[PDB]
Symmetry: C3
């Protein structure tokens, strides 16, 4: 209760700083309120402050509504001027947390937009491990929030890139310990110790990490999920009279759903693009939901969340070689029917629950039919690698996680009355090579 | 023909005795016809005669409609008086068969109502073996009818409880021989001999029995299924002018379906309970259908037979600490669209049928699509334990049993025109831990 | 372009010869145009010319409409007279290609009508390998077109029949080389060499061939598919003014679809038979589609192509002991909504594509549900026989073949605008023994 109030205070301070920074940048650039709430403008401004910290100038495309048409202009700012605007919006401090928050939003968007199969094959990883690749476009030396948000496969990928002096060993051991904390079984954690304790890591460590990544498809790791929104949402809220420091804020509770319910974000739309599909993409990004079950996402949103291959849309960002005369703008539908708490858990990994159910029928009636039985489960019952294999063999796609937990009405602020839903799952399952759904 | 007439005669005598006993008890208790046909009253009266044979008094709750409300009263009878009423309703004889018949009805209800996962984990058994647990609430020393009705897993459970002087060996060998007769493959039967022939049975016998139980999920055993109805149904039929001795009776033919079609049973309903769900529960119990494919049960009944976890109902029996002022009564819908012969068979166990079908496609047209193939079947082709494993590996959920046999119209008394149906299967498949359906 | 023109020329010559032959036979027999376009008459005439080449007389049932009824008459022709009529319709030449073309049509019909499970069990083959049995009713010494059209399992079957002097060795090695050319992986081809190089082939070669046949269910071979129509279709087109020599013709392009769109074929219908089901059977035969995915066939045809066990129809040919007074005739619906190029390819066999997708989810929200993952795929990653096993283990029913290729509008003659469809698959999957669909 008091610990939550304290967390909400610091998060609320962070969000307030991003908001004031964005308001300042909008006034500097003389953008209208609508233009300030165009997501492409928000991404440019976010990129500029990140570039300023992460000639000595930074910039990008800024889009204005001029004479009934959308116009693109490349603006340039001194990196030192941007740094001063950020620091002073955050009351003198560097506020690295706000920067990392915007990085995670960018990361969550990239996770929803692009598949990193090229990066995966380069590191010797299965391109089908995408659900483990949360935060893979984040830098290696990210923040505490960045490390928490990164998937098991992202950590594996970064660790193999290390394998392929004194500061290199500390970085290697730190990343092993980050990965270890994500694993929910002792057997997986022990294998990470065996990789961490390796003097001169090589092929044996590579193989162990690939093994661990594949185990995390079934024995999933604890990855944090944070709803991180474009800076324009925070800026527009601060400007309109919302005080994030007095109200507090949460990345995992109702707050971001309530905030999106009271916001209006815009997007540039290419010809032949569906705005609803652009909306779905950004909504998924907003709630870090790229690798979620599409059934869960659909039920929360209230409209079908379709696979990536069914979306009639390209990326949010507009390339510099694209024609602006064919560009239209529309509202992004970023609201939801319900809301749900964002989890750090990877679900159940305990295979010794002595779980109750039914995996066969016994015929009562003399009637022609096939006799259903759960083959893989029945047949499954017949050092650390072999234990992990056995734990994976015990697991079933049917096994239920998050028991008793449900979605909530937007009016249910205290999360008192959970709605447990009656349950195509893979967002990246629909491509020209695989029909995984 | 003559053997069937002889069986129908003895069964008809048994049913007549139960009927006359129940009529007598209803007059003793001064119950109205409606009250006599309340299933909770029937269960109490059934329990009293079973307790009298299986201070020196027996009793239970009897429910009466008094001043527009349902009232509960605890009655007590001398066990000797009940025994005299039972014996004399059965023309002087002990009639142990009628008692066992009522026990099987109770067992079939328990199988439909409760899952015995606690009893299973105590004996070292997988709680998912529930479909093998028919008759598990029956006493070890039941009747011939009780032994026939018991599932493979029930026999395994009882045998492990033995493992955990001269009369103990005979009981052990008898139960091994009961189990052996249920198995349809020689390899399974041989393993039971190896368990039976064991001097000082222990852990090796325990492991063999667990192995055999799991094999019975695929290579299913021959378990008898008997439609055993509450005593009020038999009593109401005898009273109304049906002579079971002259007509004969069958537990596995059309008779019980015809009887339920001409009967009206009632149940106490708690607030917020669906009467149709209470009806489904009792209908399943009546025809020993707890562990049947829900598709088969649905097609016969004519209405959807949903999983236990979807039923808005608790048990039939009302606890002594429940409030009677909130209790209502309603008719139990125990009729069916069709009827079907109850089987003793566990389906096909012969894996050497050289069965015809198709497990892959060959592309004819140059069109983008996935290429379907039956993976587990294709990959499967690459002493007694290993043979059983191999037989289990050969089996498929798609394989058809009871070829040429179908359901029947209620008017089709001779079962001349079988309706073969075009075929969620697990009744206990829908819980907070597993979504098996 | 020039190679295609050359192929179209020779194929067009072949089709023209069959057409002129059939016209001649119709005039000889004094059949009306409608009677000539009855498929049963076409099959008899086709059989007669094949028998004449493959006392010294040949014949069969010819059906005429006489006095409002269908009448059967057994006609007999001198085999030498038929041979002269065929040769002279083909401008003096033997034209063995036209004969083989009619044989393939007969083969494609047999593949759609009958399952050869008896022939399969006699050769030690799995009756479920039917999808590999294209061209199994064709003679061993068929043509070049006959060899190309034969399935992997057909070649295996013929090779085992050889196993069960100098000319026998050449025939054995030729058939091994035919089979080898069908395999798309080097590992499969190498095993065929090891069977071919065997002095005195026996049980070891038998086992290798059974292994190879089963591998072809997953690592499918390159089998040719040719749309071969009843001779009455070609005859009716030539008679109506279509010049196949000037227009050219193709067995794998749009031509046969265009030809069927401009044709009208009839069939004798038994009482209680659905004409639409008779139509489906002949349509499948016409396009060599017995072993295709029923989803692909359905989408092309524009109406549901149901499994064989759902078809209310027997074979096309009428037995000599059947009553003609109950026979009716109807139009065969042999048209299609779309068309598609017939392929020689067996789909993708390359398991090293580093294919992109998703085989698990990572939970974002704290909500009760099961957590989907692709079990067989995840678990799969944990000399020539073992490599083939490993390649089979890598394959998935979800993997996509023929990428970028689609169906076409009947008006799209050049195949410029492919329609890729959004994808019950087995035609022989619905029987009393197996529910494979
Ligand atoms: C209650 O009204 C106000 C409240 C505050 C300020 C102005 C108004 C206000 N003044 O005038 C009108 C009109 C107003 C109004 O109705 N709204 C709608 C809600 N809205 C808003 C709400 C939330 N959060 C929660 O409510 C919440 C509730 C429970 C837990 C966690 N969070 C967040 N957030 O969580 O980020 C962002 C926004 Cl923008 C603020 C404006
Ligand atoms: C044919 O009518 C009678 C028949 C007998 C007694 C009275 C009547 C009768 N007297 O007046 C009316 C009115 C009556 C009447 O129509 N019914 C409905 C059927 N019913 C009934 C039927 C059966 N069985 C079979 O019919 C059967 C048929 C074929 C095989 C196996 N079993 C069972 N049984 O099997 O347990 C219980 C009952 Cl209660 C008896 C009363
Ligand atoms: C364009 O019209 C004619 C054309 C020719 C002869 C007579 C007529 C004609 N004279 O009067 C009328 C009226 C006519 C008419 O409209 N049709 C319909 C089409 N039909 C027909 C078409 C084809 N093939 C293609 O068109 C094709 C197109 C592109 C690639 C491959 N093949 C085939 N074939 O491929 O086997 C069989 C037949 Cl029977 C011939 C008669």
């Amino acid at each position: 209760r008091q610990n939550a109030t304290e967390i909400r205070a610091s998060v609320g301070k962070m969000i307030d700083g991003i908001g004031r920074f964005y308001i300042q940048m909008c006034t500097e650039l003389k953008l209208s309120d609508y233009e300030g709430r165009l997501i492409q403008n928000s991404l440019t401004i976010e990129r500029m402050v990140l570039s300023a910290f992460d000639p000595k100038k930074t910039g990008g495309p800024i889009y204005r509504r001029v004479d009934g048409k959308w116009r693109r202009e490349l603006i340039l700012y001194d990196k030192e001027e941007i740094r001063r605007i950020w620091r002073q919006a955050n009351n003198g401090d560097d506020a690295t947390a706000g920067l990392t928050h915007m990085m995670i939003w960018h990361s969550n968007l990239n996770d929803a937009t692009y598949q990193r199969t090229r990066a995966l094959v380069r590191t010797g990883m299965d391109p089908r491990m995408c659900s483990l690749m949360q935060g893979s476009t984040l830098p290696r030396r990210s923040g505490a929030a960045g490390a928490a948000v990164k998937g098991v496969g992202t950590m594996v990928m970064e660790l193999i890139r290390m394998i392929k002096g004194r500061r290199t060993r500390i970085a290697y051991e730190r990343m092993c310990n980050i990965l270890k904390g994500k694993f929910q079984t002792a057997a997986q954690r022990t294998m990470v110790d065996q990789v961490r304790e390796s003097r001169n890591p090589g092929n044996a460590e590579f193989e162990d990490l690939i093994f661990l990544a594949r185990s995390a498809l079934i024995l999933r790791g604890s990855v944090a999920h944070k709803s991180c929104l474009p800076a324009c949402v925070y800026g527009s809220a601060v400007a309109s009279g919302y005080d994030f420091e007095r109200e507090g804020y949460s990345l995992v509770g109702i707050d971001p759903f309530r905030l999106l319910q009271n916001s209006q974000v815009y997007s540039l739309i290419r010809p032949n693009e569906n705005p609803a599909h652009k909306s779905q993409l950004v909504w998924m990004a907003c709630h870090s939901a790229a690798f979620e079950d599409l059934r869960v996402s659909s039920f929360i949103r209230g409209t079908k969340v379709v696979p990536r291959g069914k979306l009639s849309t390209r990326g949010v960002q507009i390339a510099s070689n694209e024609n602006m005369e064919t560009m239209e703008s529309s509202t992004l539908e970023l609201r939801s029917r319900y809301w749900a708490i964002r989890t750090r858990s990877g679900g159940n990994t305990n295979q010794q629950r002595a779980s109750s159910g039914q995996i066969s029928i016994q015929p009562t009636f003399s009637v022609q039919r096939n006799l259903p039985f759960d083959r893989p489960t029945i047949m499954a019952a017949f050092d650390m690698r072999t234990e992990i294999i056995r734990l994976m063999e015990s697991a079933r796609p049917e096994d239920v996680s998050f028991q008793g937990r449900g979605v909530f009405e937007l009016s249910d602020e205290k999360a008192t009355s959970p709605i447990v839903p009656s349950f195509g799952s893979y967002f990246f399952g629909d491509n020209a090579e695989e029909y995984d759904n």
